[PDB]
Design a protein around this ligand. Structure first.
Ligand SMILES: C[C@H](OC(=O)CCCN)c1cccc2c(-c3ccc(CS(C)(=O)=O)c(Cl)c3)c(C(=O)O)[nH]c12
Ligand SMILES: [Zn+2]
Ligand SMILES: [Zn+2]
Length: 231
């Protein structure tokens, strides 16, 4: 009943983890450049429907996600938000779009996904283009903290449960490096994390884009590992 780790999930299977009432994470694994990585997303109950945050990193993983949701929860996924343009966030959007899910991302994410050759969410989320912006989306708040892991990364807060989903701007406590920094801004990242800390001081659970949830310490730890990576 502990949170599931990379070696416990074969590539292609998806597990769900109950975070709070009406809030789950989803965990899947994928191969990239010859190594296997876990990744997280979020599911938030929206009355008799579900809001999905992020794909399960690939088409077959995302199909498996939908099946796992049907088995474990049994409510329809009606909308999905992708929190940046990388394949661990948008790979699977075409599966979602063929299963009746309306897919959303910021215009910045949509442009970057298109330029990269990744799958492209259908609908643009306006109101998020300046750092510190926040908008409501069903049962969550979407927040743009500034450039961090990527220039487009969004953060999601579930106010009913004080759950902060940091996405790939936030690392797990065991991390020793800042993950895949190919598209990152290591210089701005600590400032962006500080904006998150200031905006969401009552967060009780913090979920990283990859690895184990914890508390607010994940934010400071992230700042620490990024500053040492830049060095
Ligand atoms: C699909 C994604 O592509 C990119 O990001 C740039 C693609 C450029 N064409 C990706 C592919 C493969 C791996 C990742 C990782 C990752 C996460 C955690 C760790 C452990 S640790 C202790 O370093 O935190 C590591 Cl090693 C990597 C992350 C992330 O950091 O969000 N994104 C990853
Ligand atoms: Zn990424
Ligand atoms: Zn990531």
């Amino acid at each position: 009943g502990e949170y599931p780790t990379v070696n416990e999930i074969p590539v292609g299977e998806v597990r769900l983890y109950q975070i709070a009432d009406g809030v789950w994470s989803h965990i899947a694994t994928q191969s990239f450049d010859g190594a296997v990585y876990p990744s997280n997303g979020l599911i938030v109950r929206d009355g008799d429907e579900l809001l999905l945050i992020d794909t399960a990193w690939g088409a077959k993983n995302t199909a498996a996600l939908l099946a796992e949701i049907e088995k474990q929860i049994g409510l329809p996924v009606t909308r999905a938000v992708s929190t940046h343009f990388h394949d661990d966030r948008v790979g699977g959007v075409d599966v979602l779009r063929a299963a009746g899910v309306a897919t959303y991302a910021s215009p910045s994410t949509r442009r970057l996904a298109e330029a990269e050759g990744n799958e492209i969410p259908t609908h643009s989320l306006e109101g998020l283009s300046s750092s510190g912006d926040a908008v409501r989306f069903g049962p969550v708040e979407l927040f743009y903290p500034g450039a961090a892991h990527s220039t487009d990364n969004l953060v999601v807060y579930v106010p009913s449960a004080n759950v902060l989903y940091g996405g790939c701007a936030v690392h797990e406590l065991s991390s020793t490096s800042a993950g895949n920094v190919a598209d990152a801004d290591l210089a701005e990242w600590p400032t962006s994390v500080e904006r998150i800390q200031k905006h969401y001081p009552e967060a009780e659970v913090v979920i990283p884009g990859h690895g184990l949830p914890g508390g607010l310490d994940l934010l400071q730890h992230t700042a620490n590992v990024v500053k040492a990576h830049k060095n």
